Design a protein around this ligand. Structure first.
Ligand SMILES: Cc1cc2c(cc1S(=O)(=O)N1CCN(C)CC1)S(=O)(=O)N[C@@H](C1CCCC1)C2
Ligand SMILES: Cc1cc2c(cc1S(=O)(=O)N1CCN(C)CC1)S(=O)(=O)N[C@@H](C1CCCC1)C2
Ligand SMILES: N[C@@H](CCC(=O)O)C(=O)O
Ligand SMILES: N[C@@H](CCC(=O)O)C(=O)O
Lengths: 262, 262
């Protein structure tokens, strides 16, 4: 059958996909910039398809409801046929692999801690052993699910606190979490992926930092629906771009070449 | 059809697979220890198969001859039907993906520099700009192929020197390379994967070290022949073990918990 424009789901998450300053006078894919916008263009070229970037309707990564088994976020879009591919900082997880396919990873990450500078916290164990400083994670993402299922005493203890914390310690978007750290006088710390932590650490006002080692070792993959023709070509594209140096170049472009903190 | 014992190809490469001290009085899989021996046991359990570890006959990772298109090493064993799966520090590369399947990566690495302590070399550029200190790579592996195809001025310059260097700067095994660094009075440096470099840095006599940043960002994958039933189960096994913490535990076990250099 004839080639058709591929519907790409992605998420507004800096510096992966961001609105261009002048987006109001732009159309289509041209409205957007970032690592994943650059990566989509390269994947598309190698795979030989035309594509339309579409921001995920519900603004979520993807979680399955325990009772209903319904998926939301970008994972849901793939599962229910509203997108052909997800090119986003979407973490490869076993439960997600039940319902979608992931490419080999194009970027590594692990769960990490973001503090406001000066906060007397160096580690997850530190957080777990006190109550003065609140802490949380993003809703409907892999970090929250990590804590929910972890067996580890410290993380299990963190999860027991976070799940019942009031007011809620969970946030709707990464930017909300970062804003919360910045304005809570060191009484909130944020659990988020090292990639996003390390990005924000080099953004003005330069008042946050990453502390501790990463809690785990994971990757982002390009996701396609089960049985999609596209998966094979996508996986070869990722390997090619890795070997060409493109993944390294794009990481440096969007994290460090553009860093605002000296 | 009935389950059959799975023939696993692997390679004697420390600390992935090593002979046990008392191997002469042991049989079968019990002759061996290391990261990949531990990983094979876990993969097998999750995938529900019985297996036989078999050291690759020609002692090589895998390279394709330019003229004949024949494959050697573990890749060859999979290609020609002499093994069902490779569980080894086998690097995921696009050319290898032509003829075998790789799982998602279970360990990260990049090409790095090993020096004898005291050698006035901090980087690949350093090596490229002088002739007093010789340098090389392992034959029939991904590091040599990296230099052979690289476009980068420094690496292209390194490749031009290495390919014509006399006496040969290439080595038959990693241990030969390490031994060569140790006994060449700082006049040989060795290009090898960060994983193996970082292992040897914590081995007596503690006379080597890693210098510079990694030249690339790659991973090891479990490899199966094209069309193997096993690939799907293997990929889910890797994701499960990642999420359980097993990959982190085994890395720490074989690299750092056992370090000999304080
Ligand atoms: C540039 C890059 C390439 C690859 C990865 C991560 C990265 S990284 O952006 O996470 N990179 C930045 C520089 N170093 C910190 C290494 C990690 S990855 O480990 O997830 N996957 C690799 C290979 C792609 C096929 C599987 C392994 C490419
Ligand atoms: C423990 C570990 C787990 C995984 C990787 C690497 C590693 S690591 O041994 O290379 N690890 C050691 C500790 N840190 C240095 C992070 C890297 S990986 O990036 O190659 N692959 C991940 C996920 C497995 C599915 C794809 C991503 C698991
Ligand atoms: N990368 C995560 C979202 C961020 C997070 O959970 O910290 C995901 O795919 O769910
Ligand atoms: N891991 C490499 C071997 C070691 C090297 O080339 O440095 C491979 O699969 O070829």
């Amino acid at each position: 059958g004839a080639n058709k424009t591929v519907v790409v789901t992605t998420i507004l998450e800096s510096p992966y996909v961001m609105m261009k300053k002048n987006h109001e006078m732009l159309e289509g894919n041209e409205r957007y910039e970032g690592y994943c916008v650059d990566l989509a263009a390269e994947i598309a070229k190698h795979c030989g398809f035309k594509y339309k970037l579409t921001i995920v309707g519900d603004g979520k990564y993807g979680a399955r409801d325990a009772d209903t088994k319904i998926w939301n976020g970008m994972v849901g879009e793939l599962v229910y046929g509203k997108a052909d591919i997800a090119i986003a900082p979407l973490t490869i997880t076993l439960v997600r692999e039940e319902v979608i396919d992931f490419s080999k990873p194009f970027m590594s990450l692990g769960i990490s801690i973001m503090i406001k500078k000066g906060t007397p916290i160096e580690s997850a164990e530190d957080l777990s052993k006190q109550t003065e400083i609140a802490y949380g994670t993003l809703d409907s993402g892999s970090t929250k699910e990590f804590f929910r299922r972890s067996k580890i005493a410290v993380f299990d203890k963190m999860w027991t606190y976070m799940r019942s914390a009031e007011p809620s310690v969970f946030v709707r978007t990464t930017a909300e979490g970062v804003a919360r750290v910045r304005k809570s006088k060191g009484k909130y710390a944020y659990l988020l992926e090292s990639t996003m932590n390390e990005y924000i650490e080099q953004r003005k006002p330069c008042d946050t930092m990453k502390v501790g080692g990463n809690l785990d070792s994971k990757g982002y993959g390009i996701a396609t629906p089960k049985g999609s023709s596209l998966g094979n070509a996508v996986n070869l594209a990722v390997l090619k771009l890795s070997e060409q140096g493109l993944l390294d170049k794009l990481k440096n472009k969007w994290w460090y070449d553009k860093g605002e903190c000296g």
